[PDB]
Design a protein around this ligand. Sequence first.
Ligand SMILES: NC(=O)C1=CN([C@@H]2O[C@H](COP(=O)(O)OP(=O)(O)OC[C@H]3O[C@@H](n4cnc5c(N)ncnc54)[C@H](OP(=O)(O)O)[C@@H]3O)[C@@H](O)[C@H]2O)C=CC1
Ligand SMILES: NC(=O)C1=CN([C@@H]2O[C@H](COP(=O)(O)OP(=O)(O)OC[C@H]3O[C@@H](n4cnc5c(N)ncnc54)[C@H](OP(=O)(O)O)[C@@H]3O)[C@@H](O)[C@H]2O)C=CC1
Lengths: 222, 223
Amino acid sequence: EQTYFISGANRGIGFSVVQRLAAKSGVKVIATARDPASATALNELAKENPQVKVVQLDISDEESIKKIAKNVSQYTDSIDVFVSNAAIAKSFGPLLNTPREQWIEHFFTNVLGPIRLFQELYPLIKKGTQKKVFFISSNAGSLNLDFGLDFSAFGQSKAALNYSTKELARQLKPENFIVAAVHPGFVTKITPEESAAALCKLFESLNTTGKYLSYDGTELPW
Amino acid sequence: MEQTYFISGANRGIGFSVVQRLAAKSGVKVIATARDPASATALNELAKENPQVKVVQLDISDEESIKKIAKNVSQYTDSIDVFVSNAAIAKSFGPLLNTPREQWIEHFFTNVLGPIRLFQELYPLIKKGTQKKVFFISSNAGSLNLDFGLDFSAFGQSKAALNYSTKELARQLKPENFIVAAVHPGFVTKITPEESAAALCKLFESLNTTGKYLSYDGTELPW
Ligand SMILES: NC(=O)C1=CN([C@@H]2O[C@H](COP(=O)(O)OP(=O)(O)OC[C@H]3O[C@@H](n4cnc5c(N)ncnc54)[C@H](OP(=O)(O)O)[C@@H]3O)[C@@H](O)[C@H]2O)C=CC1
Ligand SMILES: NC(=O)C1=CN([C@@H]2O[C@H](COP(=O)(O)OP(=O)(O)OC[C@H]3O[C@@H](n4cnc5c(N)ncnc54)[C@H](OP(=O)(O)O)[C@@H]3O)[C@@H](O)[C@H]2O)C=CC1
């Protein structure tokens, strides 16, 4: 039996991942929402598949992160596969036109949030069997891709977390952790369904650390 | 053909050495900043002997200080030819699990937001100058593609984050004929601040291409 943890499971790719894991036998899922009482789809997911555990997490909120280990510990002794999915993408375009609040929000939500979350949940991952750690990144976060778009605070935040993900992969290799940054795809666009199926395949199959992977299993340049 | 340079963090280190270097060049006005000018002994003595050097207050962690830098710099000049974001911190190294919340925050505000805000406020002054050059003092530690077998924690992340945004800015301002660079000033191979400042000042003067990540010696670094 394996415990997966998924932040931001109330809608989008996160809901799609939880819905697919729920179908796989011997999988417990800790699923988070900012507001689990409004998370209508996820609550019915969990009611029909009670191996899905619905927990409060706001990744912008240090008081919420300071509770996540307790909240997860209610349902499990360990985490096999940790997935930092919950994130924002509110600010694009030129730097001269990106205000202070946009830079601050993407940093706290998209960089600090996931680092604090991983810090809080490391003890539980440590005790699990798979020791897999996924941060949902974006190809927009590469220092070495040109989309003909500016990504402002969004891109900056994905590049920032990518830098720390790379370091974390190095730091935990001695502990046999598998650490990855994964672009979930453009969800040519793709459905949350497709993104999620590809994401679950990669989560199960990935056997080496320090990779930056697109959903299809191919590598991206940091 | 008089030029104006702006150097943040000129009270000590590389920044002091850059201002000292520029102070020796004929036709070069230097706006030099310190968080606490009253205690900037060496920079004040330089400025007392060399009236081309203007000392102004700036705390790049402090939005209230940033909201004032443009009007304060404008008392001393109508334009900036060469903008150098040098002031920065480096206090957070080693593993992610040992780096507390406050270190990630401080490096973001001082090393990412500060320089971005400082550039936002000084852009009109720079647009009005001739050279239109914009330097961010980065680190080779900020590269997503260099391995030094060291952890750089929040310091490294802050330099990578500012690098990402520097690369974007170079694209955005290419049509306005700006030159934008991230520059590694060296390990201050061990070099002195004065050695770094001599190399940096040659590079500021000579660089005629935008979007480069460079070392002090003018060689390129991978993003
Ligand atoms: N979709 C795409 O094409 C691309 C997206 N990505 C990555 O994909 C992920 C998006 O996943 P998906 O669920 O489909 O996205 P959605 O846009 O559908 O929604 C974002 C998710 O994050 C949650 N969330 C937002 N802010 C917070 C917060 N402060 N605290 C807690 N939860 C929060 C949302 O919950 P709530 O409903 O409460 O807001 C929701 O679950 C991101 O990690 C992003 O980096 C990367 C590249 C492109
Ligand atoms: N030294 C090296 O080997 C390397 C240096 N660098 C970069 O080179 C640049 C210069 O480094 P170095 O001279 O050694 O730095 P120092 O540590 O010697 O000093 C940094 C400078 O920034 C100022 N400063 C710090 N915080 C603030 C703030 N909140 N507001 C305004 N000014 C501030 C300091 O003023 P105060 O006296 O008030 O603290 C000082 O003038 C930095 O951007 C640094 O990151 C990068 C990698 C290698």
